[PDB]
Amino acid sequence: LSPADKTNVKAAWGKVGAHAGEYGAEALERMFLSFPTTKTYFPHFDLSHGSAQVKGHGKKVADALTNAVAHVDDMPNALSALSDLHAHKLRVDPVNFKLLSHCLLVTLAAHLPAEFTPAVHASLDKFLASVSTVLTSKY
Amino acid sequence: LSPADKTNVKAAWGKVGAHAGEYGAEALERMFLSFPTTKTYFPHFDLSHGSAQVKGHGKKVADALTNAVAHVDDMPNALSALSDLHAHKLRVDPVNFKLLSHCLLVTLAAHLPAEFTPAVHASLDKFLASVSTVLTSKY
Amino acid sequence: HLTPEEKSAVTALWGKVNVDEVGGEALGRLLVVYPWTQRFFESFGDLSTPDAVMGNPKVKAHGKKVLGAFSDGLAHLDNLKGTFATLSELHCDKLHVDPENFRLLGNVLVCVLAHHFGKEFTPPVQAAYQKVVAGVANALAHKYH
Amino acid sequence: HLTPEEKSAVTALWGKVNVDEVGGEALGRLLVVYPWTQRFFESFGDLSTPDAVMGNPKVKAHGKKVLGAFSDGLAHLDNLKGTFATLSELHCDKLHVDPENFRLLGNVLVCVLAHHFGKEFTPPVQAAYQKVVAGVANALAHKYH
Ligand code: HEM
Ligand code: HEM
Ligand code: HEM
Ligand code: HEM
């Protein structure tokens, strides 16, 4: 990531703040309704609106993205355990990282209108593309 | 790449040798005939069969890949200039690297049937993927 | 492929779309977020920075034409292959645009609708709009298949 | 859409294809080169290593049935959407396979035809077969549109 993209990502994610866990839950809900093939990965979850488990898993996805922002420079080593889970154990199809990234971008657009510029949009896409690259790096 | 991957790539590309540029030229020809959208990036070229321009470019691509194998552990710094050329100046669509990677595999297979085992197939595909990621890194 | 409550929600929201500005915001965002796409719009002029792209008057003007094509698609959801036969020919035989880029403009359009409607752009509404844009991308891709 | 001299080179080469081995070869390479596709085939047994996959009797057997569907598609290149209607329903509604994977199996088949036929697999022959495997891939993905 370029110095300008790091500054733009930190600006945007700063303003998300204490609502990150809530936005992580909305992104997972949007993905399951819009791309219903992704549901085959959560057969052990209640995937109805306001499910305790989806709220629970929203916080886990958000805390991991906050970590990735604090370690943007050493992402491969910050997420290396999550790269093992998603490739080796779970066997997640790489195409599915692009569907969740799109659903996160739709969630931030809807909550942060003032912050979601063309410039900031572009930098957040590169950032989520970087996070997806690491999470599929055991392939 | 993994230790096993590095070994399979070095061993396969060792047994290409002098034929490197001949093989590169064939891959470009296979690309232009199979995927006709890629012909628009070379308007200043004679793209007819047995073309002198394609043979000379063939050898440039081949030499670029030999360096990448020889610097397998420092790939972003052995291909730094070519990302600038491909991403910033030429605006090459990222789908197109996947089409060339595939025609490069159909060439190595037609010519080295003994060396083109399924494990060596897997190793070359990860290598050309890695080369493709570096060349698109300025997006 | 849209339930009765879907088609009503899609239509209801569309009517409130600023037709002058949404299509130019979506085409502008495609060109900034996915820069390889800028080589097809060389003759539109200055696309050197994000602020050049958004304010470029040819981009705004052409953005209205794209949004018009989408409205025409929404009117004929049961016959999209027939409505976009001429445009598919333009993009596929003449301009040589990879069909993956059609999916990228559809997804960028969904981002822009969420930017403008915020809370109203609910997950069930988003899911109806994804089917539509997938519908349009597959119809523009027909002359390749 | 193939020319007469394309369709005659596609049909000529296929007659020489060892229908027993190539099918298992194509299915085995997909599972080894793109390891996420193994989760669709859990009941086939041991896919832990490349030697376990290639030498796996259920993979070898299932390969014959895939190649046998490719052999029926050539016969009916003018009605693929029809030929592949039942398999479209199976792959998209029951199994939930991402259509990106259909293209990968088509491309792995092309690398295998190249491996066996060598210098007889000419750039113009490959461009004809790349038209077939895309046309197959699209036909399979119809139930998603
Ligand atoms: C930016 C993208 C993603 C991030 C940051 C992410 C992060 C995480 C985290 C932090 C966990 C919990 C790990 C733990 O339990 O210790 C997890 C689990 C999981 N993720 Fe993801 N994930 C991402 C994308 C995906 C995608 C695209 C899929 C599937 C389509 C997926 C499927 C799963 C599944 C099935 C689990 C295990 C759930 C369970 O058994 O409790 N993830 N992910
Ligand atoms: C593994 C993938 C690739 C490698 C290693 C590669 C390598 C190279 C090299 C070494 C050059 C010449 C640089 C010089 O002047 O010294 C070059 C030029 C070029 N490449 Fe690539 N390339 C790749 C993929 C692609 C693809 C997929 C496209 C387009 C579809 C493309 C389009 C071009 C063009 C247009 C030029 C400039 C030709 C000219 O005007 O002189 N490249 N490439
Ligand atoms: C769903 C996606 C799309 C729709 C609905 C769409 C629609 C249109 C329409 C209505 C026109 C004007 C036709 C005319 O004036 O004759 C047009 C022109 C054009 N489109 Fe698209 N388009 C789409 C995607 C794309 C993409 C992704 C690209 C490039 C990456 C592209 C490149 C062009 C170009 C270059 C022109 C011609 C502009 C000129 O007059 O010089 N289109 N499109
Ligand atoms: C692209 C061309 C493909 C063709 C022509 C094809 C063909 C077939 C055929 C003929 C069957 C057997 C149907 C029956 O007799 O009941 C089948 C089953 C199946 N296919 Fe495919 N297939 C393709 C791609 C894929 C891909 C890409 C995947 C997964 C990544 C896949 C996964 C399966 C699975 C899981 C089954 C069910 C096998 C069982 O458990 O009995 N297919 N396919």
Author numbering:
A (entry chain AAA), B (entry chain CCC): 2 to 140
C (entry chain BBB), D (entry chain DDD): 2 to 146
Publication text:
In addition to collecting X-ray pump X-ray probe SFX data of haemoglobin microcrystals, we also collected diffraction data using a single pulse, in which case shockwave damage is necessarily precluded. We compare the quality of the diffraction data, as well as the crystal structures determined using the single-pulse and pump–probe data, respectively. Crystal structures extracted from the two data sets also differ.
